[PDB]
Paper text:
For example, Chikungunya viruses inhibit stress granule formation through the interaction of the viral nsP3 peptide with a specific binding pocket within the [name] domain of [name]/2. Here, we designed stable molecules to mimic the interaction of the FGDF motif of nsP3 with [name]/2. Two such compounds, referred to herein as [name] inhibitor a and b (G3Ia and G3Ib), bound to [name] with respective Kd values of 0.54 and 0.15 μM binding as assayed by SPR. To better understand the nature of the tight binding between G3Ia and the [name] domain, we obtained an x-ray crystal structure that revealed a number of important hydrogen bonds between the compound and N122, K123, and F124 of the protein. In addition, a key phenyl ring in G3Ia extended the pi-stacking network formed by F15 and F33 of the [name] domain. While [name] is also the dimerization domain of [name]/2 proteins, G3Ia and G3Ib bind to an interaction surface that is on the opposite face of the dimerization surface, thereby leaving dimerization intact. Thus, G3Ia and G3Ib target only the protein–protein interaction domain of [name]/2 and specifically block [name]/2 condensate formation while leaving the dimerization and RNA-binding capabilities of [name]/2 unaltered. The presumed mechanism of action of these compounds is through antagonism of binding between [name]/2 and their binding partners within the [name] domain, such as caprin 1 and USP10. The loss of these protein interactions within the [name] domain is predicted to limit oligomerization of [name]/2 proteins, thus inhibiting the valency necessary for the formation of the large multimeric protein–RNA complexes that comprise stress granules. Using the nsP3 peptide as a lead compound, we designed two novel small molecules, G3Ia and G3Ib, that inhibit co-condensation of [name], caprin 1, and RNA in vitro and inhibit the formation of stress granules in cells when added prior to either arsenite or heat stress.
The most central node within this network is the RNA-binding protein [name] and its paralog G3BP2. [name] and G3BP2 each exists as a dimer, with each monomer comprising a folded dimerization domain ([name]), a folded RNA recognition motif (RRM), and three intrinsically disordered regions (IDRs). Dimerization via the [name] domain is necessary for stress granule assembly, and experimental disruption of [name] dimerization results in rapid disassembly of fully formed stress granules. The [name] domain also harbors the binding site for other stress granule proteins, including the RNA-binding proteins caprin 1 and USP10, which respectively promote or limit stress granule assembly.
Residue numbers in the entry:
A (entry chain C): 4 to 42, 51 to 138
B (entry chain A): 3 to 43, 52 to 100, 103 to 138
Amino acid sequence: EKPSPLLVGREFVRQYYTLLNQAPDMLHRFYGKNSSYVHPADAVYGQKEIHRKVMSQNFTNCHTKIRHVDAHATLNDGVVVQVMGLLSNNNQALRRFMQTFVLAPEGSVANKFYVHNDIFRYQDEVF
Amino acid sequence: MEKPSPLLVGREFVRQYYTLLNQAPDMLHRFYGKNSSYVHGADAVYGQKEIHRKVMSQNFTNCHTKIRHVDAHATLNDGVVVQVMGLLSNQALRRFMQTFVLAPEGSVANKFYVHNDIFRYQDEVF
Ligand SMILES: COCC[C@H](NC(=O)[C@@H](C)NC(=O)[C@@H](NC(=O)[C@@H](NC(=O)[C@@H](F)CC(C)(C)C)C(C)(C)O)[C@@H](C)c1ccccc1)C(=O)N(C)Cc1ccccc1
């Protein structure tokens, strides 16, 4: 009675980068109040702030290359997703990245998730 | 005040993990329970026993790490999610990425089990 975590992750990642490229300003409508967002720079928290952060980064004509994506079940019908790839902006240099997300039942509508955590880091910023 | 700091449960976990990796890796199965999935280099083997078996497969001998940064944040049900970025020699350091999810044990707080452990060298992706 249970979607495939693995599948559920690729679907999410697909939705994520389409939307990050199409309209990155309802992007915050993926997260609830108690979410976490990053992209050394501290994470920011909840909708209004995650939304505000997304704006601050002028995401424009945003291209991706998802080179890898694991996902598993985690505590309480959650789903965690590792994702490694290349991301561009203002059609500039593609930079490697390493990403972790937690998806967790939204709970009102069944089999609908929300992003409790979205940790993203460029290898060139850390390595 | 009611729950441990996440980052602190995060940065101390990594400490215990990769240390216990250079030290006896025939102990890591301690860290896990019977809902726990382990995924190194790739479908997850569950439980202390298979994960142990999987650990041992890897002949972790004089494992050398080098953490470059760590994110640990709070997730549902007082869980701590943890993305690690570093280099792992086990021999040339190999850029890597390890995601964890730490879940409250239940009986007592400040006490957690590793529900999840997903590893990928980068030079295998890309
Ligand atoms: C019969 O044996 C009996 C089972 C037994 N297993 C466990 O408790 C498992 C199920 N769990 C662990 O080991 C976890 N350990 C802890 O939660 C410990 N807490 C702490 O030191 C810190 F959280 C303290 C604070 C950071 C909150 C200020 C503690 C004291 C044991 O509660 C690890 C996975 C973890 C997870 C997140 C952050 C750090 C460490 C166990 O064997 N040990 C505790 C010993 C051991 C040795 C070596 C490796 C693992 C376990």
